[PDB]
Amino acid sequence: ARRAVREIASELVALYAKRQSAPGHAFGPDTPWQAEMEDAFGFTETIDQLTAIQEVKSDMEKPVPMDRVICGDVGYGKTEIAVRAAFKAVQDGKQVAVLVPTTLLADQHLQTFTNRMAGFPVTVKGLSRFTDPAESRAVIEGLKDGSVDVVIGTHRLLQTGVTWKDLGLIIVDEEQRFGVEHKEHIKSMRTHVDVLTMSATPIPRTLEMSLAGIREMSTILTPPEERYPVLTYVGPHDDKQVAAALRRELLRDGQAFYIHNRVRTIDEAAARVRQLVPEARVVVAHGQMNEETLEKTVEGFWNREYDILVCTTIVETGLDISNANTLIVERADTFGLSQLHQLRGRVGRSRERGYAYFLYPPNKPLTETAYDRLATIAQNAGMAVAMKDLEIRGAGNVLGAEQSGHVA
Amino acid sequence: LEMSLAGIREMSTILTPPEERYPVLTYVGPHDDKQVAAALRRELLRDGQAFYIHNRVRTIDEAAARVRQLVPEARVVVAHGQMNEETLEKTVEGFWNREYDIL
Amino acid sequence: EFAVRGGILDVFPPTAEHPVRVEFWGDEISEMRAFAIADQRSIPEVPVQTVVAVPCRELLMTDDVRERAAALAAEHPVPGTVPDMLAKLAEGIPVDGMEALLPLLHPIEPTTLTRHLPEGAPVLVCDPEKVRTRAADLIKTGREFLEASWSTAAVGIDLEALGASGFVTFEEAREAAREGGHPWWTLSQLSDESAVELDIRSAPSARGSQHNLEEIFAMLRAHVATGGYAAVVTPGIGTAHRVVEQLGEADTAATILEPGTAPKAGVVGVLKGPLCSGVVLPGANLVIITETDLTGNRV
Amino acid sequence: EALLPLLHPIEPTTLTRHLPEGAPVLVCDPEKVRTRAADLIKTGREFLEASWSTAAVGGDAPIDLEALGASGFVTFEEAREAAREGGHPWWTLSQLSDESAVELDIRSAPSAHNLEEIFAMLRAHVATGGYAAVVTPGIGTAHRVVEQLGEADTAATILEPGTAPKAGVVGVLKGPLCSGVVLPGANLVIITETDLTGN
Amino acid sequence: QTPIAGLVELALSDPSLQDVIRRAADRPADLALVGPASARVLVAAALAQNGPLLVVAATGREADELTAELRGVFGDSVALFPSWETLPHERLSPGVETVGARLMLLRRLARPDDETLGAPLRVVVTTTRSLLQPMAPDLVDIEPVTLSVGAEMEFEDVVARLVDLSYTRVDMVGKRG
């Protein structure tokens, strides 16, 4: 363990040394327009958000090349600190680039950025998978005169032929979701330019204290509004109950997730849902799907062109659909407890309450492994073994290695 | 028959002169999945609705499943005379108020 | 949830901001502290005098429901099953979905909300037409969940005894309100020759336009020059000074009003408060515009 | 018509080349037009791929659908440049407020109760000595409006076609105007019948 | 007839609409207006004071409505360039009525001073479909069949020209073409 662990620490202190030793153009004080934009925030800031806001402004004003991550799960003021850090960097002459692993995140952050920086001469565009070369090549990719100040894009911004006339800030949300061929680029551009990364996977409290001097880290935990728990039913799969819960979402003009993990029989499952709810736009999405149809299918889902998304566990966990507030999981005995927690987490995260249905088959009796696991989900200590799992994956992202043979 | 009954049962036979009638564009030819699917997507694009005809009620659920295979994003129901009168008048009033795409 | 130590019981009422720590000395409460969930430690900066622990479910766990559930368990002797509920209900432990068995667990002549208002208190229905369509969808959604979650295939129970707990119609609720002494009054925005119309009209909305906004500002300026009252109500936070600046730009004087006070005649008053849309009362020589009326974004 | 790049191969032109040499182009709701343009080539390409594919056309000879594309829809930017590069300016009218654009001092007619409030609306403006007009599709509906508005204490006449409304009295008129305009610069209010009625 | 021509001329007296034609007179490469859809009629009627004009709406329904209210001010000077009902590569010919309307307007634009076709066109309203759809340049060059009383022509030559214009032959006419 120690000998394997020592390689991690050495590479992390070496990156910290190479960062504080190398040169870096600092950013000036706050532009007067920056404070007016803080008034434009239509909500109250949390204590952790404001204190993190001062922590992101300290090392940007400092001559150090910045490398900080923001921790805390979805729905917090994380993207807001990105908009202010981006406004302070544009209002000091430099440009901002926002790298996201999905084009949905490109469209979402683009909308969040354009809305906030309206009423100010902050030119903002976006280059993702679905944009014509007329706007891509000329407006977005045609960056050499410094026209676009802030851009939100995908790995398409890492192609050979992209330039940035005096760029000064880079923002990467969910860095771990990039490819190996792209994470090397984002890992390279760290000493040259002040960067700020964002993440929702939590790290253990012991880890955060351990690397307090090596990896500068600003985590937030004060909630803006209290999240109220989703109502969870666990039981046998009945078509009339599935149809009532789906119809209850469509009535409130909401969407729903329908989990079917076996891709070989995923279209058979959609046909069953269309049969039950014939007034629902029902589409499927999985990883064995080619990339363009997947990003287009979920582009439409976010744009409310579909009502039920029959997707796999790995598609659903990587999607922020605040309007999807009902989760239905066929064959809930087939899932680890931590997978049920993650599936359930991405619904009902807003002011409107969510509903989660964990259904086991009615044709066969349950095994000895599942009856208590599903009962443990019905209960509002046995789940603690599964939330410790969610910390393991986060530790593999901040340490830069899986070391699966040494964790076990 | 109209003038034969002129004294008994009078009529005001108002009709559309074929000069003011915009006819329906009719295509004849072999069945093609992509052609049928594209023609339904075009109608659905302008927020329209469509009739899909199938008389063998015993296999009409297969027919709905087959058009759902052609256009998965469409909402599709069946309506036939062997139904309960309520479920048919229900299915029909839903189709009129645009709750369904293909009938 | 409630925890029990020696002489200390922690309890978290469902209607409370924080849980409270109750400490006894003999058989009386010695001290009461409010604590936090994260660190389980007392919070001394908030004081408590009394705490009221209302029920967490709309019934009382009695012996009658324990024997009536055990008798119903003899009719149907896995978590999502009906007998599993009645099994824990035979022991006196509540479970989810319980709220569907009160017609069988606690048989009682059900009343409705109006009975609980004090004698003579009226009921004001806002947009009764929209209330009726919503009443239709609720009853339809309610009976759909009854047939779905309480079918004979779901239990492996008489649905019409359960129907006593289901939604009653708009007219059954209106008559129940009038039979109990509560007048049924309505306020609608659609016309009616049978109704009294109020000398009140809605406020101008800017709809994201600049000339709209300049017009509304010129309207408020002309009205305070009249000698009438004008008020811009701001629900948002830190967005009242911006309105004062926008009215100064529009050659209109305005101050920020101390909360609770009324505006002064001849000066536009910017008041922080909850108001979703503005109002014009020419009888009161008063016009109110809200932040949503100027920007077009709800809060 | 779907085989004309092959039955009559000629360099295709566009509608702009047929307009008078000075005529400009004003596009209404240009983002909707662009969105519709993305739907038109998508449905268009869908039909081309569907109607002349290998599985539909007879064997032993394919169809040159790259050549058929000479008649398919041009793109939104391609028709915008081909218009301005031929003498036809590409001007824009939009509903979404733009700061680099020029905003007309024109308000939409408020009409969606909202009936007597609109007749009081017109009675208050007509009393101020400002121009006002009502436009109905039918001449019978106009005469219904001259005394529907007459039931309230507000004068109302009938205008002759092609005549300007009087300076003090409202007036119903036969016209095809869909919705009305409110223009303070001329002290003018037009109320249509489509927005005044519930139809 | 031009019923609301005086009412629209009444509305064009506003300095903002007077501005739009002041800027459009100089003919700038870039001009972006913003206003309610209720003002489409006035803006088109404003730009028409300087000369011809093409107005493009998104859907055919909006083009029909805009052409309709525009006929209340300019009468026969407004005309619609209609859409196809079939995509350019669809195994289905478009409407004979709409093809006629398109070709009739293309020649009206070619021959503004020809009374046989209508008044000189000041506003032509069309859709994004017909704006983006390419056409053959020689469509206007197809000579129509003009029949007036007293015109000396051959019977069989008029018949042979009508079929050349894709007219179907019948024993009894029942449809157009």
Side-chain angles (χ1 to χ4, degrees), chain A residues 1-2 4-10 12-14 16-17 19-20 22-24 26-35 37-42 45 48-49 51-52 55-56 58-61 63-87 89-93 95-98 100-121 123-124 126-138 142-143 146 148-164 167-169 171-179 182-183 185-186 189-202 204 206-209 211-213 216-221 223-224 226-239 241-330 332-350 352-363 365-367 369-375 377-379 381-387 389-392 394-403 405-408, chain B residues 1 3-11 13-20 22-33 35-97 99-103, chain C residues 1-24 26-48 50-65 67-77 79-108 110-118 120-128 130-150 152-178 180-189 191-192 194-206 208 210-241 243-250 252-297 299, chain D residues 1-16 18-44 46-59 61-84 86-106 108-110 112 114-115 118-122 124-125 127 129-148 150 152 155-159 161-162 164-165 167-171 173 175-178 180-182 184-191 195-196 198, chain E residues 1-8 10-142 144-153 155-177:
Chain A
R2 301 193 207 256
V5 176
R6 285 196 204 110
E7 306 167 12
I8 317 192
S10 64
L12 305 186
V13 286
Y16 178 71
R19 186 171 65 85
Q20 283 263 129
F27 291 98
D30 278 339
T31 301
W33 289 339
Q34 208 270 357
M37 188 212 43
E38 319 213 318
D39 287 327
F41 188 29
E45 289 96 356
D48 300 53
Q49 296 178 12
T51 51
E55 290 180 347
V56 315
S58 287
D59 45 357
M60 267 204 307
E61 285 174 349
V64 316
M66 184 182 185
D67 182 70
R68 219 187 259 283
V69 85
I70 296 269
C71 291
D73 48 338
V74 302
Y76 286 82
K78 186 183 310 108
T79 314
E80 173 79 16
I81 315 158
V83 309
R84 318 202 182 183
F87 195 71
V90 165
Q91 285 306 311
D92 275 340
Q95 296 178 347
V96 186
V98 195
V100 290
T102 74
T103 85
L104 181 137
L105 280 165
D107 289 325
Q108 281 183 339
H109 284 308
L110 177 62
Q111 155 169 287
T112 302
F113 279 27
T114 57
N115 281 336
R116 284 282 323 232
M117 317 222 286
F120 297 93
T123 70
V124 49
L127 194 160
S128 35
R129 152 174 287 97
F130 292 110
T131 169
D132 50 55
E135 180 92 25
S136 318
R137 152 77 78 75
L143 194 275
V148 47
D149 291 330
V150 48
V151 62
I152 309 98
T154 83
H155 62 80
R156 292 192 34 78
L157 287 187
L158 307 176
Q159 298 285 324
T160 63
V162 295
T163 63
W164 272 288
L167 182 139
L169 188 58
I171 298 203
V172 177
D173 166 30
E174 298 303 325
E175 176 177 353
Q176 71 276 15
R177 294 183 61 183
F178 286 93
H182 298 288
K183 276 192 294 300
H185 289 81
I186 297 83
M189 297 115 76
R190 246 171 186 80
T191 55
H192 324 323
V193 173
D194 292 319
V195 312
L196 169 68
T197 44
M198 284 176 19
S199 191
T201 73
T206 310
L207 206 53
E208 186 183 352
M209 299 293 295
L211 309 86
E216 316 198 63
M217 177 135 35
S218 191
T219 87
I220 88 168
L221 309 96
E226 190 178 9
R227 155 190 81 180
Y228 302 122
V230 316
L231 299 179
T232 299
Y233 171 83
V234 49
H237 190 281
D238 175 293
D239 288 325
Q241 303 180 357
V242 174
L246 295 170
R247 277 191 245 269
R248 195 240 312 271
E249 267 289 319
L250 309 193
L251 184 66
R252 70 212 271 209
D253 281 328
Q255 280 130 292
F257 287 115
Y258 198 94
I259 298 305
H260 187 77
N261 219 5
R262 211 159 53 174
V263 183
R264 164 182 58 95
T265 166
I266 188 145
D267 297 319
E268 195 257 307
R272 286 192 284 109
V273 176
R274 300 185 185 97
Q275 182 66 257
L276 294 186
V277 184
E279 68 270 11
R281 283 83 55 96
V282 184
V283 301
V284 317
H286 50 84
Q288 225 179 289
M289 205 173 271
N290 95 317
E291 188 72 22
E292 184 201 357
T293 61
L294 178 72
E295 305 241 39
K296 191 68 192 177
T297 313
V298 317
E299 164 171 43
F301 186 63
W302 182 59
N303 291 122
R304 305 212 50 202
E305 292 181 1
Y306 312 120
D307 300 318
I308 300 176
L309 183 66
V310 176
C311 52
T312 58
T313 322
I314 315 91
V315 174
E316 195 267 355
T317 54
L319 273 172
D320 186 18
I321 307 285
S322 68
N323 194 28
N325 293 316
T326 279
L327 167 87
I328 301 195
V329 179
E330 285 186 354
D333 50 357
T334 75
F335 294 93
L337 204 154
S338 58
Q339 294 168 9
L340 300 177
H341 185 259
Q342 291 188 133
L343 289 171
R344 180 160 111 228
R346 325 283 277 111
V347 298
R349 66 167 188 91
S350 59
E352 226 167 3
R353 175 170 305 270
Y355 307 88
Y357 284 19
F358 298 115
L359 306 181
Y360 51 80
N363 52 8
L366 282 198
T367 171
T369 86
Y371 53 72
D372 41 7
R373 197 173 40 194
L374 311 201
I377 291 285
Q379 191 177 4
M383 189 153 337
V385 81
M387 295 216 230
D389 189 341
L390 312 175
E391 282 165 349
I392 301 172
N397 303 326
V398 73
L399 297 175
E402 69 281 11
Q403 315 244 353
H406 293 283
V407 177
Chain B
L1 180 59
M3 282 142 58
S4 303
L5 273 48
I8 289 96
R9 199 172 166 95
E10 286 76 359
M11 323 196 162
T13 312
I14 176 175
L15 69 75
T16 87
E19 297 85 316
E20 287 274 64
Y22 285 138
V24 170
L25 301 164
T26 309
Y27 171 86
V28 70
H31 166 73
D32 185 81
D33 273 337
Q35 288 175 1
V36 172
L40 288 165
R41 289 202 228 264
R42 168 182 68 189
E43 180 70 36
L44 264 65
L45 191 60
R46 68 169 168 196
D47 285 333
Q49 291 147 280
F51 292 109
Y52 191 88
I53 302 304
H54 180 87
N55 279 329
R56 184 109 197 107
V57 173
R58 304 83 188 150
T59 61
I60 199 146
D61 289 338
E62 196 214 315
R66 171 190 330 145
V67 305
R68 290 182 181 121
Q69 196 64 37
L70 266 54
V71 175
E73 70 270 24
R75 31 212 204 290
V76 167
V77 305
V78 317
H80 54 84
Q82 297 186 1
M83 287 180 170
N84 287 326
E85 310 80 10
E86 178 60 283
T87 47
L88 163 81
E89 300 274 345
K90 203 117 52 185
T91 304
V92 156
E93 81 170 344
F95 183 67
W96 177 53
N97 273 330
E99 292 188 8
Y100 303 118
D101 288 326
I102 295 165
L103 181 54
Chain C
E1 299 173 338
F2 78 101
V4 158
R5 320 303 181 195
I8 296 201
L9 92 169
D10 296 337
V11 66
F12 202 178
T15 170
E17 192 176 313
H18 310 110
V20 299
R21 169 152 302 131
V22 194
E23 161 180 316
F24 304 77
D27 277 333
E28 69 170 0
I29 298 178
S30 98
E31 199 207 349
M32 273 194 311
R33 310 159 258 157
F35 64 97
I37 293 295
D39 55 3
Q40 293 284 312
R41 294 292 293 280
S42 301
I43 303 174
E45 308 108 53
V46 313
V48 314
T50 70
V51 305
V52 169
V54 299
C56 287
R57 311 181 99 130
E58 291 191 11
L59 88 165
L60 179 56
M61 291 296 314
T62 63
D63 289 330
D64 198 359
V65 306
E67 62 169 61
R68 194 123 45 187
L72 208 52
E75 184 182 344
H76 303 276
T81 57
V82 185
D84 179 71
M85 289 186 282
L86 304 155
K88 286 178 259 176
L89 292 181
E91 308 291 326
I93 317 159
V95 278
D96 276 345
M98 186 175 58
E99 284 78 9
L101 294 209
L102 296 321
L104 295 183
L105 287 179
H106 184 65
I108 180 153
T111 168
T112 167
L113 179 65
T114 62
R115 173 218 176 265
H116 298 269
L117 314 166
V123 183
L124 178 65
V125 177
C126 290
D127 277 331
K130 191 178 180 167
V131 168
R132 300 217 209 214
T133 88
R134 182 56 172 159
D137 288 334
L138 279 166
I139 294 180
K140 182 168 71 179
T141 307
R143 203 130 267 161
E144 182 177 359
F145 269 94
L146 168 60
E147 297 171 3
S149 288
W150 293 110
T152 58
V155 310
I157 280 77
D158 191 62
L159 292 213
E160 290 65 26
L162 276 71
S165 63
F167 298 122
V168 309
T169 78
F170 179 90
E171 281 290 342
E172 292 179 349
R174 164 196 279 170
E175 186 64 26
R178 288 178 183 164
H182 307 287
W184 188 272
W185 300 336
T186 60
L187 166 81
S188 188
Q189 36 194 358
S191 269
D192 187 15
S194 147
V196 155
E197 68 146 33
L198 305 155
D199 194 47
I200 318 166
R201 56 192 192 258
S202 56
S205 185
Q210 184 68 34
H211 286 83
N212 272 120
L213 196 48
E214 295 274 336
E215 208 173 5
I216 315 191
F217 289 179
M219 189 234 75
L220 297 146
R221 177 180 180 190
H223 188 209
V224 288
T226 280
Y229 298 91
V232 180
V233 174
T234 325
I237 317 99
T239 166
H241 67 86
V243 180
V244 184
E245 289 285 342
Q246 289 197 292
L247 306 178
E249 285 184 345
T252 319
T255 67
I256 294 178
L257 298 177
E258 32 170 342
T261 60
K264 278 79 186 174
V267 161
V268 179
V270 179
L271 177 67
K272 185 246 176 51
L275 256 176
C276 300
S277 293
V279 153
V280 175
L281 302 113
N285 202 0
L286 170 140
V287 50
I288 325 183
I289 315 296
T290 70
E291 176 179 7
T292 56
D293 301 332
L294 309 181
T295 78
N297 276 83
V299 202
Chain D
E1 289 81 0
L3 295 179
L4 286 207
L6 298 67
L7 301 179
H8 191 270
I10 197 56
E11 195 60 35
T13 183
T14 40
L15 177 69
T16 61
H18 302 258
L19 297 145
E21 296 291 320
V25 176
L26 169 70
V27 309
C28 306
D29 301 338
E31 257 298 309
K32 298 296 173 295
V33 182
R34 224 189 312 242
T35 310
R36 191 80 173 82
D39 283 322
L40 281 169
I41 40 63
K42 181 184 183 183
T43 325
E46 186 163 355
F47 273 53
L48 168 67
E49 200 265 324
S51 282
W52 308 87
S53 59
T54 59
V57 198
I63 302 296
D64 192 5
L65 308 97
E66 188 177 2
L68 269 87
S71 67
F73 302 111
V74 315
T75 76
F76 180 89
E77 287 296 343
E78 278 172 1
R80 178 179 172 260
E81 189 84 302
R84 288 195 311 163
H88 311 287
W90 187 273
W91 296 338
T92 280
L93 178 51
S94 152
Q95 304 180 191
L96 302 165
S97 287
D98 189 292
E99 306 82 13
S100 78
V102 156
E103 176 173 318
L104 296 169
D105 203 358
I106 301 165
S108 58
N114 281 325
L115 183 66
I118 304 184
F119 282 114
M121 196 226 101
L122 266 68
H125 184 204
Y131 293 91
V134 187
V135 174
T136 78
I139 190 59
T141 309
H143 286 133
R144 184 68 179 108
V145 167
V146 308
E147 63 202 18
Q148 254 199 332
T157 74
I158 288 282
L159 308 87
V169 180
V170 307
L173 251 198
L177 194 48
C178 284
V181 317
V182 193
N187 203 347
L188 204 166
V189 161
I190 291 153
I191 308 275
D195 50 359
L196 182 53
Chain E
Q1 193 43 263
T2 88
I4 62 176
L7 177 55
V8 174
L10 171 47
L12 295 185
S13 49
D14 160 40
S16 82
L17 290 174
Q18 287 298 317
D19 187 62
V20 159
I21 52 197
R22 193 266 302 164
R23 336 187 90 148
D26 296 329
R27 308 178 56 78
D30 286 75
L31 173 60
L33 304 174
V34 47
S38 149
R40 291 184 188 178
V41 201
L42 306 174
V43 177
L47 300 177
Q49 308 278 115
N50 302 334
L53 156 67
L54 180 74
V55 197
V56 156
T59 47
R61 172 171 291 263
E62 286 164 344
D64 287 334
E65 300 197 41
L66 192 51
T67 306
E69 49 202 359
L70 269 179
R71 215 188 291 306
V73 48
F74 300 109
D76 201 19
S77 296
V78 199
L80 171 80
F81 191 71
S83 298
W84 272 22
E85 301 90 357
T86 55
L87 294 170
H89 303 104
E90 183 171 3
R91 292 201 52 192
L92 193 44
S93 293
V96 154
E97 302 76 25
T98 44
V99 165
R102 297 185 82 202
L103 298 178
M104 174 63 71
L105 187 126
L106 290 184
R107 281 187 85 263
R108 282 183 70 191
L109 286 184
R111 325 230 291 189
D113 299 327
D114 201 354
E115 320 78 16
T116 192
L117 306 185
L121 281 172
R122 297 183 67 184
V123 187
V124 172
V125 199
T126 178
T127 63
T128 169
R129 179 192 294 260
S130 292
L131 175 74
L132 303 199
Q133 195 166 347
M135 299 176 294
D138 56 351
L139 285 177
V140 189
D141 301 321
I142 317 195
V145 179
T146 311
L147 312 188
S148 35
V149 48
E152 254 165 343
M153 270 175 300
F155 181 85
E156 288 294 331
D157 287 336
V158 170
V159 174
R161 189 54 175 173
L162 279 184
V163 48
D164 280 337
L165 303 189
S166 291
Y167 283 63
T168 311
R169 186 155 172 171
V170 282
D171 63 9
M172 170 174 144
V173 317
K175 322 146 45 186
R176 305 185 203 262

